[PDB]
């Protein structure tokens, strides 16, 4: 483990690449356009980064189209594509310190987190899809004997991925890992709030043997994301972000060329703690992690803690104690568990919910902006006790603000849990076999954790929304359906 001083010294010597990566090479944006890539830690300008517009999106899409239709990557045998993707992941791992530091500088995420969750998660995602390429195939149908009936999957062609700033490298890889394994060309549009790791891994991709045009990164703001959703030559768009943008993406997809559109959106995920919870200390610590990890900037954040009246007093005590480890600090410091909020606008939005919370609920802990003098954006881990219809209980805050909701019986907790337009995740804590399975079946969410929350990172578990928390799944073999088409081939022999 490197020390704070070690990370600070590396940050001082770090050469940061800000150019787009398009068709096998770094490029400035057309006409010399840039934006300032600012660090949430302290407001320092890290780099000028390409600000792409239509000329650049069009160049990226054309190169992707050219490379797909030429079969430079789709036409490789399964084992050969697996070998390239493994090499890229190995490279990510070889450059883990650099990539981790870029992520922590760019997005304010603790270095203890980026070195262990974000960069290894990205590399694992790429490796797992690489390793799956040559293990699973299509079907020979049980059809009439005069036919040879085959059902196969083929890459869709050109895939656009627009990803958010809360997990820049990790969400990026959840898109490009499966899309590339399937043989697609990819145009990735990282958030203007976190372009750097995307850019960096693009360079490593080409170094590993991903052909020119197969993996392109187009930094910029809203416009290049629009243009990719509208593009006549993009076959699929995969987005993780907010709902207004998500609803916009689906609309331009349909209105243009009916490109496949796949969204992973926000949540107001409920975390239900029952009296027979096997370990109330682990549950309280995990309830804190569920909402304060990555500064609450987690679509699956456990932002509604539903707790049974019988254990509520003791549980809230343990929660408050747990919240202490998440006092904000410099994310370059490896001992820090809560880093910086991504920018002032996000900070202000979070403080606005904290203000609503003060009026409608009981403040249990936290609630203040801190370290304003650093030039960065920091807010204490904050807990309120509220009714389930409170503003902060209903609306996604995307910050370290927990809504604690009391209930008297399990069916009530289930009713409150499901009373939302969101459906990304849920959890229940209970020692009882029947309760565990019965409640887990009834929670209307894509991921249900039992006696855990945000547990591990296993690629076998598809991840995504019911209702308005997105369509389709990331992770697992089911992720590949978003980036392939089915084909039935009926071969008549006589």
């Amino acid at each position: 483990k490197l020390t704070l001083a070690d990370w600070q010294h590396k940050a001082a010597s770090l050469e940061i690449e800000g150019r787009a990566f398009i068709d096998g090479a770094s490029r400035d944006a057309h006409g010399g356009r840039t934006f300032d890539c600012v660090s949430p830690i302290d407001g320092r300008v890290l780099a000028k980064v390409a600000d792409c517009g239509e000329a650049d999106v069009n160049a990226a899409v054309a190169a992707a189209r050219r490379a797909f239709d030429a079969g430079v990557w789709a036409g490789l045998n399964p084992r050969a594509r697996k070998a390239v993707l493994l090499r890229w992941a190995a490279l990510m791992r070889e450059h883990l310190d650099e990539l981790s530091l870029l992520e922590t500088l760019d997005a304010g995420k603790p270095i203890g987190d980026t070195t262990t969750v974000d960069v290894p998660g990205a590399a694992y995602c790429v490796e797992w899809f690489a390793e799956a390429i040559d293990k699973v195939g299509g079907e020979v149908a049980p059809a009439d004997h005069h036919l040879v009936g085959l059902v196969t999957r083929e890459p869709v062609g050109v895939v656009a991925a627009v990803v958010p700033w809360n997990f820049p490298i990790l969400m990026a890889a959840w898109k490009f890992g499966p899309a590339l394994a399937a043989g697609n060309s990819v145009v990735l549009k990282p958030s203007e709030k976190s372009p750097l790791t995307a850019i960096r891994v693009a360079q490593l991709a080409f170094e590993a043997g991903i052909p020119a045009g197969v993996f392109n990164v187009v930094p910029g703001a809203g416009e290049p994301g629009k243009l990719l959703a509208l593009h006549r030559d993009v076959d699929c768009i995969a987005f993780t972000g907010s709902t207004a943008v998500g609803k916009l993406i689906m609309q331009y997809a349909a209105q243009s060329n009916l490109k496949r559109a796949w969204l992973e959106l926000g949540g107001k995920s409920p975390n239900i703690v029952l009296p027979d919870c096997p370990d109330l200390d682990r549950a309280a610590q995990t309830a804190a992690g569920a909402i304060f990890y990555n500064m609450g900037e987690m679509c699956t954040a456990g932002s509604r803690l539903l707790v049974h009246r019988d254990i509520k007093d003791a549980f809230i005590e343990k929660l408050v104690a747990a919240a202490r480890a998440y006092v904000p600090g410099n994310p370059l410091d490896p001992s820090v568990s809560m880093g910086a909020i991504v920018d002032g606008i996000q900070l202000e939005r979070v403080l606005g919910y904290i203000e609503a919370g003060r009026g409608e609920g009981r403040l249990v802990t936290g609630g203040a902006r801190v370290n304003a003098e650093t030039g960065g954006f920091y807010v204490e881990p904050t807990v309120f006790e509220v009714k389930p219809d409170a503003k902060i209980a209903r609306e996604e805050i995307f910050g370290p603000v927990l809504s604690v909701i009391v209930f008297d019986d399990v069916d009530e907790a289930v009713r409150i849990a499901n009373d939302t337009e969101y459906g990304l995740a849920a959890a229940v804590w209970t020692s009882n076999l029947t309760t565990a399975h019965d409640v887990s079946r009834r929670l209307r969410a894509g991921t249900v954790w039992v006696n855990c929350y945000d547990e591990g990172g296993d690629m076998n578990f598809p991840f995504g929304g019911y209702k308005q928390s997105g369509n389709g799944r990331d992770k697992s073999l089911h992720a590949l359906e978003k980036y392939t088409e089915l084909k039935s081939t009926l071969i008549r022999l006589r």
Copy 2:
């Protein structure tokens, strides 16, 4: 049964035109109806409930109530299987009635409705019913401190908006899997073909599909748009034109992000090479591929790509094959070519025929016939054209073939794939490597080799690449449109 027999049965038929909502035949709220007109002769068959906002809301509310009570979703897999099999068995018991309704309503030959449409609907239901208790979820190879499950659950309330070219068959393609998975369904059949949907809704209730769980709301574009926009619908499945599909996707997105699954148009290429195994079967099948169901088929083999070396002899054979498709009364069991659905649709087809006269070579057909009947009939029509011709590019949805010559396989594949459609394609060749190589290169959901529109097997997912739709009907893959995946991570220690 003879033509006279079917006319007699038609005269004796008591036709139900009301909606079927929440266990009951109901007029539209406020009592409005539209006239259901037969394309055979323009005769009014029935006055059909012309449903609007209040009806849509009542159907959706009952579907929601039923789903939440678990009257259907809460039945064991074998118990839902039994009810669905009983419903298909009632369909088969009522096969003459259903087949006659479909022929009267949509102008489809009784020789087809009795053998393709109605049995095809039953089969779909029966196949999904039989699959319910055969396939499950996953136990993940997860770390040992976890029990990791991956399961599928019904989405809840499913709306299904279906077209008039195969009314009962396409309806079943939606409701068979959606109901097997446990969802409540609200079906909005085309205003051009409401009758069989209404009749199966009554049979559904009779078989034991609980009130609320299967509803039919007749009417035109408005209730379909309202279902697409509805706050309490979870999923909408649509089959129709690409242009209307685009609106459906926008309605879903704008409202509640309901899942939207479309099956859309096509301009499917049917490629015939010199080493085709049997040129006479190929020619007969090529005609069937564009004249079956009056060419009102999304997968119609509407571009016949033929190699220059066999083109002359092939066209001669095709013209001979066209003779079987003389327009006639679809109540006649010897008729293969029935009526176009209405006069607006007929005029669209005749506008494309007129376009083709101007840009290519008329080979055979091209005329509207038998106008004196009050019905809508057009000859089986063949043009030779270049691939950039309007009739070669645009979906006609009538019995109009574009014959396009090519010089080598690579050119055939380029021409085949140079379209925004992607529903189906075919190639005819005796060569092993050619059959597999070409079939891989064709960008379409279904590729037929040495066949076209072959059988109806439920194991083959069916749907679009590109602008011909997203997702698949038929096959276990159809169930994915009507369920959500859930990952359950149970931590033991």
Copy 3:
């Protein structure tokens, strides 16, 4: 519902078919061999049944081999085979009273059981496999692109099935249902102790449209089973029965022509009851049913009840109370829950084990032969408290004799459970989520029941042995692997 009197009037009027069914028609055995088919209810001779030997076995195998190699059944399309199988199952249901009565008379099984479990189960098995035929397929391998790689399953050819007398029609169907669905021809050799339902369903099969030679039934004792295991033209033998006979079958299979051999053998299945069991009363009732259902003539009988010391006394009281429902009685009486032991030799074997129990443990209830004046064979439901090492606790009895073993902790109960050469099934009763999953994972047995025992009869669950309780599985899609071969076809395009 038919009364005892109705079943009696029906039995007096019944015309019982005793001929073999070979190559599409009933046949006497070569040279007019028969045995007397005796009823265990009262020793009445029911019918004279063909006693097949070498000429009959060879006729049946030759007809099966002809029909398979001609493709009369294997060459039908999936849907066509499905319809025929479904029709046969429908005929079984149309004749449910007849087949249920045959079974009750032939093997002494309660009519309330044969009408509700045995015959519906046989029909459901056939139906489930018929329905599965056109739903699952082979593979298109993710192979190098110059190949089309297919992985398919093909019927093995001629399948011999040798089945026991404890569940005559049900175990027969568990073999023939999947074997026939896959397209094989079958030569079924039912127990000399229970030939009649097998014979009857062969006629129904032919009426349904199963072609001549595709389903054959050859009644007789051990000789035709020996011949089938040794036959040079049989490709597969599936057996259910005793271990020593299974060992003979496996040896004869190997030495003759390496025909596939698949065995379902006996058990000494442990049923573990912990203090946090959700419902001690249901646990006790189900423990009684686990050992007294079908006279304990059940390979999966819950014949070792492991109970925690803290609840042992209370549990044993409830067990004795539950045992009262299984007083032996006339199986033709629909109110009877436990019928006759199959024959005197079996009865004396069970009484021998009971004497052994008296020598090494404590008799809790039962213990005695009853109703000897009937000419039938009956023994009370019997319970002993014994040490885990006891003779009755180690060896399979195949009668209504329960070994109750105390334990002091869950690890001990797992060690006792697994300390056997058997591994057919096990069960644990606990309300705790972790215990349930942890214990069910550690139990070395093919079926594990949690908070139930011998629960329902769902076809999705493979059923069979670890260790010496057999190889391979009956029920589920996995049962098809016993009757098919894999083929990889590698098609090189260039």
Copy 4:
């Protein structure tokens, strides 16, 4: 590397002869050894542990203890994957050493062991390790009061007895999947090829496979018998002759009913039809099918069935293609056919060649060569025979081809299937229907079309119909041999 380089490596090579049991290299009971003799020139390479009952027992006990302690089975899937990947990477690091051991021990051309055997071993290990965290069990579509799981668990202690024609490769085909699934393995390699098995066991331990999880017990038939009869082995996987396999099954039956999975001999037909796309490739591949690895291949294309119309010409191309397999020193990288494993095997092959002279027509080869080297070599040999010839019926396990004429495709299929074997088959044809219809009709585990022994892809289950074995090596299907199914029915209410 050149001939000289391999020569220098061999002279310097240190060869380990001890057993590897319970994480240590150990002498056999009583210090007993046997001499490991190279078939290249008859030089003694090493004295190798000659294991008996005490050693078999120490290995099985160590495997049992490790399995019970869960030092390997209780690791998470990703953790087992990591160790197995490390081991395969160590094999590849040590490729030169391992290839040279295989060549010296079993006489296999160094050009083969370096490109096929050692990389195939590593790839098999890799592929199964990469698979362990991708595929899982089932959540059954059961009644709702139940949670029904269907999982797979490791069987426990797996014994593996493998032959001498592909020592490291067939060892790996067993231990790759068996270890991936969590089992402990006791490997008993052939007394004619102990060396790579021993070395890979050391490397396994190096890479982190725990003590007692992977053991190697060198020696002859007795230890293999002892493993098949062992009271505490749960499964035995055997590859070898059909006759010894029958014994393995009986040993399993008589003892503890352990699972027995056999990969046995063959007499595989290779059918060449007149419309073969490329007769020159087919002729050269036909030669490779029988002459590769000295014909010491269970899947050897040892019956070449050729249509009468192309027979003379095809035979002429076969004869040319044979010249490439002139026996040479296996340490020479330009050599394509090496040495027969020992004198007794050579005499067996020669006995068959003499049989052929009596019942057919000797086309080429026929002779023992290079006797002066002290090694065992025989020429690539071809006979024309009727299908009832002794050499056409019986497995020879040497470079001896039986060429059989046929007059039509039905006859070729009859002749191909008229054997008690069923390991593999092939057909060459350019016709789509012929290719699919013949491939379906051939009763063998692997059917090649327009190729033979094509690549080594791990996705294709390999193994016998009839008397060529039960079960399959390679693919996810290989795992079934080393796991049990469990149904867990969890009743909630």
